[PDB]
Structure 1
Amino acid sequence: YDSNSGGEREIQRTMLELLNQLDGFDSRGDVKVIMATNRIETLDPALIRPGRIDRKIEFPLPDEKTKKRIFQIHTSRMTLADDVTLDDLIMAKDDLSGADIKAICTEAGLMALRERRMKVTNEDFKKSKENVLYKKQEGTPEGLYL
């Protein structure tokens, strides 16, 4: 970093103070501490070791049974032509986040309300999911999978 002294020997000392103060002495008693990352590789294992951190909880991307409630409740506050089926959206994308559900479920209203339509046709869900998901690696370049 910029606003910094000698880099390898600055935050080693601060994270060292975290290692001493966090779960060294000073009797925990009842002090809850929860930390969170996205990746794992830069983690010094000296805090990963037990005593200090006890549970390491991963997160998968949700399955289709849980998807229907997120798709449904993200669409719970919008006018929608309910003849369309969400199950194409629930089945098709395999590794969505909930922000993909959010982005599609707002984007289809951007396509219907793009033309002042209160309710949403299925093709606005088509342009919605094709507008959210980009660079679908299917054919072209190699597409060896076919």
Structure 2
Amino acid sequence: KRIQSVPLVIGQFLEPIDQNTGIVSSTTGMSYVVRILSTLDRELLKPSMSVALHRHSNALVDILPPDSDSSISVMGENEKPDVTYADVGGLDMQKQEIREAVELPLVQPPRGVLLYGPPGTGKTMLVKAVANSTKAAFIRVNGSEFVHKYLGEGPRMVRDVFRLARENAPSIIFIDEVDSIATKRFDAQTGSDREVQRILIELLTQMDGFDQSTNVKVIMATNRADTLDPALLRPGRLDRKIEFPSLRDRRERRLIFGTIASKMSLAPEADLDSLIIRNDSLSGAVIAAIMQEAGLRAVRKNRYVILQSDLEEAYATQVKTD
């Protein structure tokens, strides 16, 4: 036993030559004939692994249960997101639409779903709220996470995190404005554009190149779906397109208003059913903003009671920010 010991080094298991033998990697890039666990055997042995090596005895001490966070530049990790939905009021149909897109097909097939609209608008809340409700290991991405100039690492964890997510299956795959990586080289585009070549086509290769058993949905924030490609949109892969409206039917506002002023200390003047007529055809975020814009304005006026004025301040200032 005590042959094993902690002050080890890292590498990547390449390949066995035979039992208790194989070529591996070093974090020095060293790859040599070494030993491995006589602990493991075959089914026990794992054909590519981040691994544990003695320095001098220099042999495989043990696998490393999969590494994650390399560059790339990581992944979204919200483990048990904090957001309950109906925290942007009135999205039920759409939150159902997501549920229909994901929450149900996670349980029961789309391999990816398209949220369409301005995010951070509650559309990003859509993510976490459902990502919370779904309770699958959540992975956000940015289309801006992979811009690293390298022809190189790139898709690896995009593959492996994706696999790590399918290691975490059920897990979640999400992306902030994938349209950032969705742009690829249409020509010889020199710098910065060859990653997305790997990385966009990666997911394309990964969407189109992995089976439908949905423990994990590939989700993508889209206000802009154009730099995307139908290779993504290929069915069985990105099936679901959910559109963040805004817009707003009054029950939504009624629910939006009945959302923030719920938690927002108000002045009796503050009247949401006054605003239900005042507010029509707007964006829930801004609406949610106007809610807590007034949430700020009374506090900006040091009013511990947020008026309809404070609202109308927020509202009528934000009816046209012009």
TM-score (norm 1): 0.70
Q: 2:230 aligns with which of 38, 41, 45?
A: 45
Is 1:22 aligned with 2:207?
Answer: yes
- Give ranges in structure 1 of 5+ residues lacking alignment: 136-146
Aligned counterparts, 1:14-93, within 5 A:
14-25=199-210, 27-36=211-220, 37-61=222-246, 62-93=248-279
> What is the Cα deviation at residue 2 of structure 1?
6.8
Work out whether 1:134 is the aligned partner of 2:321. yes
Q: Which residue of 2 aligns with 1:3?
A: 149
> 2:202 and 2:304 mapped to 1: Cα distance?
57
CA shift, 1:71, in A, is 0.8
> What residue identity is the alignment partner of 1:81?
A
For residue 311 of structure 2, the aligned residue among 125, 134, 142 is 125
Matched with 2:297 is: 111
User: What per-residue deviation string (whole Å, max 9, x for no partner) do you get for residues 36-95 of structure 1?
Assistant: 222111111122121322222223223111211221220112332335432342233433
Alpha-carbon offset, residue 115 of structure 1? 4.1
Of Structure 1 and Structure 2, the greater strand share is in 2
Look at both structures and tell me which one has the larger radius of gyration over its CA atoms.
2
Q: Which runs of 5+ in 2 are unaligned?
A: 1-146, 152-189
Identical counterparts, % of pairs: 44
RMSD of aligned residue pairs (Cα, Å): 2.7
CA distance in 1 between partners of 2:243 and 2:203 (Å)? 23
Distance, in Å, in 2 between the alignment partners of 1:18 and 1:124 is: 47
TM-score (norm 2): 0.36
Higher relative helix content: 1
User: Displacement, 1:134?
Assistant: 0.5
Distance in 1 separating the partners of 2:218 and 2:148: 28
